[PDB]
């Protein structure tokens, strides 16, 4: 396991395409046999099924996946919260948000907003509790992301034990995450993070990415 | 020449100690035979002689020295402007400042501020013009840092040709600086910047640094 961290960005709505991005990035770092991949996340939500695919990809990752809510002013909201909860380590930049996972179903008329039945609401509730329980995070706050449309500032998040590192940039993330233990196992093994002599590689989107980012 | 960029921070007043830091960092990257060293600068000024020492160290560096005014809200003011002007490439983060190089000599009574005679003012004027001319930067704006106590926002700076890259973070600096040519030579040779496959190493202050940073 090389001491080499990868960094990549994921921004915008979560789609089937977002899964392709997460998969592509996690693989490159997997191939190369990395220490970790940091994914800078900024999402107002998106598709449930793509989200659940991403959470699985991350849960099944051979290297630890750090979800970093970044840059300042980003949010990991609705679907992006689960991605974050499903991860080996969450960091948040100052000025960012996590939560606000109230499920709506769509839009009714000229001006309205349709609330989801309790049946499917109870699924996501229980889905989020489990991600939270699984990782050793605040299952009780997690649920509130849904039940009380609850959002969190980074300082709250870390105090409630919802996230682990608050960091201004990738250098400070790497400093404050050194000798941290992943909140979930990696291919069967808990991993203890070692960013002492670490070299960082930054991955860029593709031209296809930017195009879909334009359209969507 | 390895494709490996170093990153280090320099913050606070410029002293004899600041020179030791600049020298230490530039050497490590020199030893290792780097592509470049990025120095994140945040200074309200300091000692003239330490500044002139630093400018020389940078001018005489075997690898390109990128001065990055960073983090947002930092400033490269009075002495820090010359360090920046003396460099192979200046970048500025959004929300930062450059200039305000009016030389004062000290403080007079209970409440006052002593202006410097024209004799020594004309030296710094001509010193700054030359750094600016030498590098292919706005000699005419540079002088104004002194004559009209002139400060610049990053967008101004880059439009006046005072700096070269505006960048939110080290990843964006590295993106936007790719295939840029140093504004001054490196050990006799102009260098053209190549951050394609580049691995980043981050250098931390020492415990001695932090102590002097406390006292001063």
UniProtKB/Swiss-Prot annotation, chains A, B:
Annotated localization: Membrane
Residues holding substrate: 45-48, 100-105
Active site: 78, 119
Domain of life: Archaea
Function: Protease that cleaves its substrates preferentially near hydrophobic or aromatic amino acid residues. Can degrade casein and the stomatin homolog PH1511 (in vitro).
Subunit organization: Homodimer.
Protein family: Belongs to the peptidase S14 family.
Protein's UniProt name: Membrane-bound protease PH1510
